[PDB]
Amino acid sequence: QMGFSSDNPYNKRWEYKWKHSYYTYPRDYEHTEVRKPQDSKDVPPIYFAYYKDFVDRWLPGMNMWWQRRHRIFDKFNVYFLPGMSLFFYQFADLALGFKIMAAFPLFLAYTRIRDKTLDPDFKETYLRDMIYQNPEITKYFNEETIHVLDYEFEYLPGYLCPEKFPEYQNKTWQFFNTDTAQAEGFFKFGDVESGATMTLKFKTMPIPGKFRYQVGEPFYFYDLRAEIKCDGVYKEVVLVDEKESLKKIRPFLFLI
Amino acid sequence: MWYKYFSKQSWNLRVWRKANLKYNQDDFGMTQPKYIARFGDFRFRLVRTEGALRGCMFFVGFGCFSIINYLYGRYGYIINESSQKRAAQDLLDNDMAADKILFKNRVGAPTRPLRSLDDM
Amino acid sequence: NNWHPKNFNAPRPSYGEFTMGIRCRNDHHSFLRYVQTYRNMSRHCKQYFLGDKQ
Amino acid sequence: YSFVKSLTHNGFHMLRVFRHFAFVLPATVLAGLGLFVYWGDDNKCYSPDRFPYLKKRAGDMALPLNSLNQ
Amino acid sequence: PVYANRDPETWRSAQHKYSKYISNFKSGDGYFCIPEYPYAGEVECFNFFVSDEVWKWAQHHGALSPKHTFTIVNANEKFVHYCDSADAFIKERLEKRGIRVEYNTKLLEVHQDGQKATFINTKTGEKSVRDYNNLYSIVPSKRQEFLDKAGLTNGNGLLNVDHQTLQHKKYKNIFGLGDAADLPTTKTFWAGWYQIAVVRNNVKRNLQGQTLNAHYDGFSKVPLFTGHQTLTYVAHSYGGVGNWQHLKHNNGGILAWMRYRSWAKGMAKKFQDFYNGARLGPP
Numbered sequence: 034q035m036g037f038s039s040d041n042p043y044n045k046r047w048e049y050k051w052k053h054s055y056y057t058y059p060r061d062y063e064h065t066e067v068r069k070p071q072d073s074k075d076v077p078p079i080y081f082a083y084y085k086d087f088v089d090r091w092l093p094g095m096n097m098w099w100q101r102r103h104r105i106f107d108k109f110n111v112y113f114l115p116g117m118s119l120f121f122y123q124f125a126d127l128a129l130g131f132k133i134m135a136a137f138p139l140f141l142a143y144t145r146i147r148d149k150t151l152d153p154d155f156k157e158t159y160l161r162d163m164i165y166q167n168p169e170i171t172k173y174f175n176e177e178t179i180h181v182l183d184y185e186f187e188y189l190p191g192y193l194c195p196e197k198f199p200e201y202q203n204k205t206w207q208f209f210n211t212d213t214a215q216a217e218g219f220f221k222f223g224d225v226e227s228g229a230t231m232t233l234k235f236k237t238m239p240i241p242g243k244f245r246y247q248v249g250e251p252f253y254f255y256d257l258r259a260e261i262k263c264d265g266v267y268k269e270v271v272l273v274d275e276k277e278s279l280k281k282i283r284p285f286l287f288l289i
Numbered sequence: 290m291w292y293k294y295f296s297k298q299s300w301n302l303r304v305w306r307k308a309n310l311k312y313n314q315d316d317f318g319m320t321q322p323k324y325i326a327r328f329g330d331f332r333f334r335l336v337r338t339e340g341a342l343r344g345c346m347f348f349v350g351f352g353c354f355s356i357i358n359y360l361y362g363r364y365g366y367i368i369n370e371s372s373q374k375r376a377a378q379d380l381l382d383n384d385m386a387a388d389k390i391l392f393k394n395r396v397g398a399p400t401r402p403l404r405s406l407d408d409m
Numbered sequence: 410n411n412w413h414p415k416n417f418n419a420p421r422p423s424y425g426e427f428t429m430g431i432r433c434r435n436d437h438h439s440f441l442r443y444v445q446t447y448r449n450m451s452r453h454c455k456q457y458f459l460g461d462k463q
Numbered sequence: 464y465s466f467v468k469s470l471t472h473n474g475f476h477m478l479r480v481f482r483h484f485a486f487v488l489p490a491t492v493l494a495g496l497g498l499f500v501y502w503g504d505d506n507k508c509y510s511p512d513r514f515p516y517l518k519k520r521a522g523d524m525a526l527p528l529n530s531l532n533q
Numbered sequence: 534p535v536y537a538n539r540d541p542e543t544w545r546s547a548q549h550k551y552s553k554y555i556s557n558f559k560s561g562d563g564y565f566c567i568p569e570y571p572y573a574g575e576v577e578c579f580n581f582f583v584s585d586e587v588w589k590w591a592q593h594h595g596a597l598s599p600k601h602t603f604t605i606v607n608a609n610e611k612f613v614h615y616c617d618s619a620d621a622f623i624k625e626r627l628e629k630r631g632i633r634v635e636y637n638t639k640l641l642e643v644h645q646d647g648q649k650a651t652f653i654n655t656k657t658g659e660k661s662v663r664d665y666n667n668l669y670s671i672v673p674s675k676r677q678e679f680l681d682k683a684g685l686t687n688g689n690g691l692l693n694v695d696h697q698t699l700q701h702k703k704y705k706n707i708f709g710l711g712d713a714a715d716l717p718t719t720k721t722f723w724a725g726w727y728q729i730a731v732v733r734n735n736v737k738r739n740l741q742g743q744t745l746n747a748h749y750d751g752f753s754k755v756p757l758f759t760g761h762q763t764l765t766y767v768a769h770s771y772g773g774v775g776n777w778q779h780l781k782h783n784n785g786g787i788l789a790w791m792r793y794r795s796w797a798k799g800m801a802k803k804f805q806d807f808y809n810g811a812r813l814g815p816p
């Protein structure tokens with residue numbers, strides 16, 4: 034689910050990505066059809082630009098934090114960081130260094146909340162490069178004739194099954210993380226040239242790569258499946274199988 | 290067909306949280322030495338990068354330096370009050386020793402400090 | 410040449426292995442923004458045409 | 464362009480090294496509304512407590528600078 | 534993820550893959566393979582104690598997956614052949630740490646495609662195929678055939694010389710030292726410090742026809758890294774008896790930490806003088 038969503042009807046999966054050069058916001062939301070001059074309100078009311086920024090930038094940003102509020106309720110953000118800030122706040126009048134040591138855990142908490150509440154964004158150009166290399170998909174789909182019917186991608190709540198992923202039964206990791214940082218979704222595609230449709234289901238997880246501490250890829254498709262439907266032919270293509278992928282690589286277990 | 294007009298030459302970086310993931314931190318930076326101990330390993334494990342760690346220690350350092358400057362202001366005589374009383378009487382003992390052996394002219398000025406080695 | 414005037418701070422390449430972080434505003438969203446801007450400018454202007462087909 | 468909107472680096476402005484000058488011209492224009500309301504010395508203070516008021520009441524005549532005290 | 538004991542000569546100065554054996558062990562099956570004795574670098578290349586301490590840290594904060602396997606595949610029956618005091622200490626410490634060991638098994642083939650490692654139990658002649666994700670193997674040695682065609686080696690393929698004077702049994706004008714010599718001691722470098730003093734002496738005596746008064750007592754000293762920043766010294770005579778340094782400060786501490794820094798930070802700069810001639814052996 035897209036966390037940043039306004040009353041604008043068009044391009045829901047691009048609303049957070051597109052950076053408009055508008056000085057202020059348009060008078061009306063993008064019209065879905067030709068309207069009458071009396072449908073819209075001439076000379077919008079006073080303080081309209083301030084109202085639009087609150088309902089198109091502020092409010093959907095808070096709805097994003099509220100939608101994914103379960104990813105920030107860890108003992109580190111809830112107890113440790115505010116508890117540390119209160120310890121130094123009692124000596125805020127003694128010196129300046131206590132004010133900084135009492136505000137830093139607050140800024141650190143905001144940064145963890147800011148990054149964890151964003152929409153999960155995978156490298157989509159890697160994905161389309163992967164499906165266009167498969168011969169069974171390029172038989173019915175092409176970049177010049179494909180269109181998106183539905184898109185869904187959201188983090189998975191809580192810790193997963195403690196047999197498929199024993200990594201998350203770590204008390205040190207659970208102190209900082211309440212979720213698994215893995216995401217799951219699908220892609221409803223259609224081809225206007227061949228008339229075929231497919232549901233591209235995928236599961237992602239962060240993996241380590243080539244280095245000791247840095248994550249290699251935060252959204253690695255460890256399961257990638259395509260249920261292609263045609264006129265009278267139903268094909269099932271398996272690009273990445275999880276039984277073969279989970280034996281080679283394991284999740285990353287973000288901290289902080 | 291936006292991907293048709295996508296330029297793959299932007300794949301030179303993998304930007305995520307304002308950090309390039311294809312950064313050889315095993316050969317450059319504070320994370321290059323592999324002889325780091327348990328504390329330094331767990332510290333780099335939390336931040337995953339040296340650029341983020343150094344940025345936070347920049348502000349925590351100002352707080353720690355300003356705090357220890359206060360504790361040495363309020364406190365300090367617990368450890369340094371003896372070396373001040375020692376130098377207090379020492380500052381008076383050599384002053385009195387100077388008046389005993391020093392040439393004073395008709396006005397109270399030691400105009401011959403280089404008369405002998407003990408005078409200097 | 411009115412497309413790339415010569416200045417001192419010229420564009421220079423970046424290397425993955427050697428780059429820690431970067432602050433860049435360029436993306437690949439201009440094509441779809443070009444299509445939507447046309448649909449918006451076309452439709453929002455026809456609101457005040459009163460159905461004049463010509 | 465707003466100084467506030469450029470702080471998040473998510474709308475139209477990534478690097479703006481002079482963003483702290485964005486509201487100087489608007490604030491200067493809004494201050495121009497009182498250009499004529501506050502014109503001269505008398506409109507910026509209580510003039511009877513200032514020296515020039517005394518010279519006017521004396522027939523536009525020069526007075527010693529300590530006339531407000533005696 | 535296949536690592537070895539020495540670097541290939543095709544690597545440039547910017548290749549540091551050797552140092553990623555312990556770092557890049559996020560998960561999978563890990564194997565430390567010891568070839569069939571005689572092999573070069575018996576104790577000086579035993580890094581399963583430093584990796585265990587670092588991999589213990591990785592299991593604490595989740596860097597190393599909880600389902601990982603590490604075992605020591607030893608082709609021989611014992612780790613230190615000519616010093617049973619140190620060999621008993623290693624197996625005693627490996628059990629205390631929790632490391633699993635498989636004896637009489639040697640690495641035979643490495644499949645780079647599917648990361649398959651072919652092991653064979655030389656005791657029963659039974660081979661198996663195992664998936665690996667982090668493979669370390671000490672490079673195996675090979676007896677040179679010309680030393681057998683000339684009738685100088687015996688049995689395993691080492692030089693058959695006197696244990697005292699380092700002179701060959703026959704052909705008294707021929708000597709031998711280092712690793713090629715068959716001496717009941719650990720083939721270390723400090724052992725070679727006391728073998729060159731005997732060779733340069735006895736050779737000097739045969740050039741003048743005099744007798745051989747230089748005897749080699751079988752001394753050999755090699756550090757055994759017991760931790761990430763601590764070590765103990767494996768020093769022993771010909772009869773496997775150790776000196777005052779043998780297996781001392783073996784459980785870590787300040788004494789073990791100081792001796793580690795002297796060998797890690799202050800020993801590589803000494804091999805420049807060894808080759809030039811500025812600094813001689815220990816005595």
Ligand SMILES: CCCCCCCCCCCCCCCCCC(=O)OC[C@H](COP(=O)([O-])OCC(O)COP(=O)([O-])OC[C@@H](COC(=O)CCCCCCCCCCCCCCCCC)OC(=O)CCCCCCCCCCCCCCCCC)OC(=O)CCCCCCCCCCCCCCCCC
Nearest residue numbers: 102103106107110111112113114115116117119120121211
């Ligand atoms: C006259 C008119 C005007 C009046 C104005 C004044 C009135 C204002 C009223 C304000 C109060 C109402 C607002 C909040 C209502 C929320 C009620 C609610 O039900 O929410 C539950 C709701 C749970 O939703 P859910 O998913 O449906 O729940 C499902 C399950 O139950 C989930 O299960 P779970 O197991 O996952 O549990 C999740 C839950 C877990 O909840 C908990 O377990 C409670 C933990 C609270 C910890 C607070 C103390 C932290 C330190 C303790 C350390 C102790 C150990 C160390 C001791 C060392 C001592 C030095 O997480 C939380 O909700 C906690 C979120 C953060 C709270 C802590 C914020 C710390 C602020 C510190 C400063 C406090 C200043 C107070 C003012 C006093 C001075 C003026 O959570 C939220 O909605 C979160 C809302 C957003 C967070 C609000 C917190 C304040 C944020 C503002 C930032 C600035 C703070 C102040 C700084 C000022 C100085 C700089």
Ligand SMILES: CCCCCCCCCCCCCCCCCC(=O)OC[C@H](COP(=O)([O-])OCC(O)COP(=O)([O-])OC[C@@H](COC(=O)CCCCCCCCCCCCCCCCC)OC(=O)CCCCCCCCCCCCCCCCC)OC(=O)CCCCCCCCCCCCCCCCC
Nearest residue numbers: 324325326327328329330332346349350353357360762794
């Ligand atoms: C003294 C006056 C105090 C006045 C008040 C001050 C205020 C005190 C309150 C606040 C405390 C300070 C807060 C600092 C933290 C601030 C936050 C921060 O910056 O980040 C953490 C920050 C991290 O530091 P770092 O730079 O990242 O560490 C370096 C590497 O990154 C780390 O790399 P690594 O982790 O990979 O490996 C580390 C290490 C491996 O380290 C370890 O693994 C050891 C860990 C063992 C842990 C054991 C845990 C045991 C648990 C407790 C015991 C168990 C229970 C016992 C039960 C008993 C029952 C009763 O490996 C090494 O090879 C070490 C290098 C060689 C040693 C260098 C030592 C220099 C000492 C020079 C002074 C010598 C004086 C000797 C005198 C002795 C007698 C007094 O921690 C510190 O800053 C520590 C404070 C250092 C301050 C330096 C400025 C002062 C210079 C030293 C004093 C010189 C003498 C002055 C007096 C001379 C006349 C007497």
Ligand SMILES: CCCCCCCCCCCCCCCCCC(=O)OC[C@H](COP(=O)([O-])OCC(O)COP(=O)([O-])OC[C@@H](COC(=O)CCCCCCCCCCCCCCCCC)OC(=O)CCCCCCCCCCCCCCCCC)OC(=O)CCCCCCCCCCCCCCCCC
Nearest residue numbers: 056057080082083086087091464465466467468483485486
């Ligand atoms: C009860 C009644 C009913 C209540 C309910 C109904 C009411 C609900 C709300 C209704 C609407 C309210 C409007 C605001 C909310 C709108 C929400 C929104 O999204 O808007 C976004 C909206 C969208 O942007 P836009 O439409 O494109 O353009 C907006 C503007 O055209 C221009 O945009 P801009 O971004 O270009 O403007 C920038 C400007 C905006 O103007 C300001 O906000 C003035 C800021 C001046 C204060 C800066 C403080 C700095 C930090 C101080 C920290 C300590 C503070 C202690 C204070 C103690 C006080 C004695 O700020 C600056 O110029 C920043 C640079 C300042 C120069 C450098 C100063 C810092 C360096 C010097 C440091 C010196 C100390 C160093 C050492 C320190 C010791 C360590 O942007 C806005 O922010 C709108 C605000 C415009 C003013 C509205 C006023 C309406 C009239 C209401 C009465 C006045 C209320 C405000 C008074 C504030 C106190 C002065």
Ligand SMILES: CCCCCCCCCCCCCCCCCC(=O)OC[C@H](COP(=O)([O-])OCC[N+](C)(C)C)OC(=O)CCCCCCCCCCCCCCCCC
Nearest residue numbers: 048049050051052053090091094095098467471472473474
């Ligand atoms: C302790 C008591 C409360 C303390 C006072 C708290 C005051 C908080 C509000 C003032 C500070 C706001 C910062 C202004 C600068 C950033 C502007 C901004 O928010 O952009 C949104 C940004 C918008 O994202 P953006 O700026 O990156 O751009 C979006 C991207 N495009 C343009 C492409 C669409 O979103 C966020 O930053 C995340 C949400 C932040 C939430 C802001 C604070 C909300 C606090 C709610 C308090 C409710 C209770 C109080 C009121 C109750 C009723 C009386």
Ligand SMILES: CCCCCCCCCCCCCCCCCC(=O)OC[C@H](COP(=O)([O-])OCC[N+](C)(C)C)OC(=O)CCCCCCCCCCCCCCCCC
Nearest residue numbers: 105106110111114115136139140142143146147470471472
């Ligand atoms: C009594 C006074 C002290 C009050 C407490 C300290 C508050 C900080 C001091 C007040 C500053 C107000 C003036 C400046 C306003 C900000 C200006 C600015 O640049 O902001 C833009 C920023 C934009 O940040 P950004 O990350 O989105 O984008 C910036 C990216 N760069 C840096 C590259 C440009 O938005 C902010 O508001 C950041 C400041 C947030 C401070 C919030 C402190 C509290 C954190 C939440 C509470 C957490 C409690 C625990 C939660 C538990 C889990 C739910």
Ligand SMILES: NC(=O)c1ccc[n+]([C@@H]2O[C@H](COP(=O)([O-])OP(=O)(O)OC[C@H]3O[C@@H](n4cnc5c(N)ncnc54)[C@H](O)[C@@H]3O)[C@@H](O)[C@H]2O)c1
Nearest residue numbers: 538539573574577578672677710711712713720721722725
């Ligand atoms: N861990 C290892 O793999 C390893 C390898 C070599 C040396 N070392 C250490 O160094 C110590 C002494 O090393 P070393 O000198 O006994 O072995 P060495 O391999 O280092 O020396 C052999 C020298 O003879 C040469 N050589 C081999 N075959 C030759 C042939 N047919 N013809 C001419 N030259 C030939 C080699 O080029 C080499 O210069 C060892 O005790 C050990 O501690 C370790």
Ligand SMILES: Nc1ncnc2c1ncn2[C@@H]1O[C@H](COP(=O)(O)OP(=O)(O)OP(=O)(O)O)[C@@H](O)[C@H]1O
Nearest residue numbers: 154155156157158299300301302304433434435436
């Ligand atoms: N090669 C690059 N060089 C410079 N800046 C970059 C580069 N790649 C990304 N950036 C910046 O980092 C941001 C994030 O890049 P990112 O790949 O996540 O965007 P994206 O729209 O999600 O791509 P995709 O559609 O493939 O998922 C970008 O908006 C850009 O500003």
Ligand SMILES: [Mg+2]
Nearest residue numbers: 154155156157
């Ligand atoms: Mg993306």
